[PDB]
Amino acid sequence: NSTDVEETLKRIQNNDPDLEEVNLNNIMNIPVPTLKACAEALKTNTYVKKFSIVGTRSNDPVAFALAEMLKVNNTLKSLNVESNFISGSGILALVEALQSNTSLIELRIDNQSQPLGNNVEMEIANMLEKNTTLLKFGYHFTQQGPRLRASNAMMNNNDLVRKRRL
Numbered sequence: 001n002s003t004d005v006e007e008t009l010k011r012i013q014n015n016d017p018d019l020e021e022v023n024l025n026n027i028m029n030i031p032v033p034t035l036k037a038c039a040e041a042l043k044t045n046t047y048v049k050k051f052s053i054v055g056t057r058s059n060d061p062v063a064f065a066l067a068e069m070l071k072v073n074n075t076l077k078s079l080n081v082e083s084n085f086i087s088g089s090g091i092l093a094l095v096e097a098l099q100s101n102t103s104l105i106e107l108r109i110d111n112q113s114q115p116l117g118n119n120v121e122m123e124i125a126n127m128l129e130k131n132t133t134l135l136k137f138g139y140h141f142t143q144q145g146p147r148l149r150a151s152n153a154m155m156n157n158n159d160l161v162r163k164r165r166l
């Protein structure tokens with residue numbers, strides 16, 4: 001990944017119309033403050049459609065910052081925070097943000113360092129049922145109950161798109 005992180009941050013902040021996709025995947029020396037800055041910048045950015053920070057050694061502070069962003073941003077379509085060190089608290093914050101977001105259609109939280117746990121999984125399933133705009137959720141539920149409810153929620157949301165198309 002040869003992405004210029006600082007330049008990318010600047011473009012997000014300036015709402016550069018040519019920046020539709022941000023991929024910071026596998027860049028392992030990005031300071032958390034910089035990732036936090038990207039999240040803050042996205043609050044007012046209207047052109048970035050995809051934001052990915054897979055394997056960036058991100059943690060809860062970054063997840064919470066992105067959760068705040070999701071409640072304000074109404075243009076980002078896909079957020080990927082896979083393979084990081086976000087805890088169940090950080091992940092729950094991201095999913096909870098969906099209660100007040102109708103733009104995001106894809107949220108990938110899969111493969112953090114630690115497991116979420118049944119209690120977090122159950123709350124997530126509940127949240128996915130309260131949001132009707134998300135179409136893809138990147139995560140493999142360990143528990144059957146939450147797994148089926150989430151599978152059904154995503155199927156329902158996708159059916160909505162089909163019924164309202166054109």
Ligand SMILES: [Zn+2]
Binds near residue numbers: 111140
């Ligand atoms: Zn998984």
